[PDB]
Design a protein around this ligand. Structure first.
Ligand SMILES: CCOC(=O)[C@H]1CCc2n[nH]cc2C1
Length: 121
């Protein structure tokens, strides 16, 4: 139907906007601490600690499969990256501090992203 095409056009547009948000957020991680899944080979007990792992590469895979239906779903996954890190790692580690910084700097980006999503529809 024509509706479903228009639908898919918007979803495709959303994906385009989210790809830009994702690139902007990942730029706030120049150390690439959050770029890839936590290695289960190098951290074999990770899943005992963290029930829903997340990372930027995994977000990107879902993004290109157009698997984010709205900004909220995208934001949930970003929050997982931060929150998982701040649980597993102690307050005085480079990892925890990198998560705090990413959350603070990412807030700016996500704030305008929400406006753009509502605005454009
Ligand atoms: C690539 C080196 O960074 C890490 O290992 C940290 C990545 C973020 C994270 N979330 N939970 C545990 C960790 C560990």
């Amino acid at each position: 139907s024509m509706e479903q095409v228009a639908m898919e056009l918007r979803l495709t547009e959303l994906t385009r906007l989210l790809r830009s948000v994702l690139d902007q957020l990942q730029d706030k991680d120049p150390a690439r601490i959050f770029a890839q899944p936590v290695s289960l080979k190098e951290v074999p007990d990770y899943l005992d600690h963290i029930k829903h792992p997340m990372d930027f590469a995994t977000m990107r895979k879902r993004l290109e499969a157009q698997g984010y239906k709205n900004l909220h779903e995208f934001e949930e996954d970003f929050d997982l990256i931060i929150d998982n890190c701040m649980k597993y790692n102690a307050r005085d580690t480079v990892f925890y501090r990198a998560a705090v910084r990413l959350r603070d700097q990412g807030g700016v980006v996500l704030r305008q992203a929400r406006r753009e999503v509502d605005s454009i529809g």
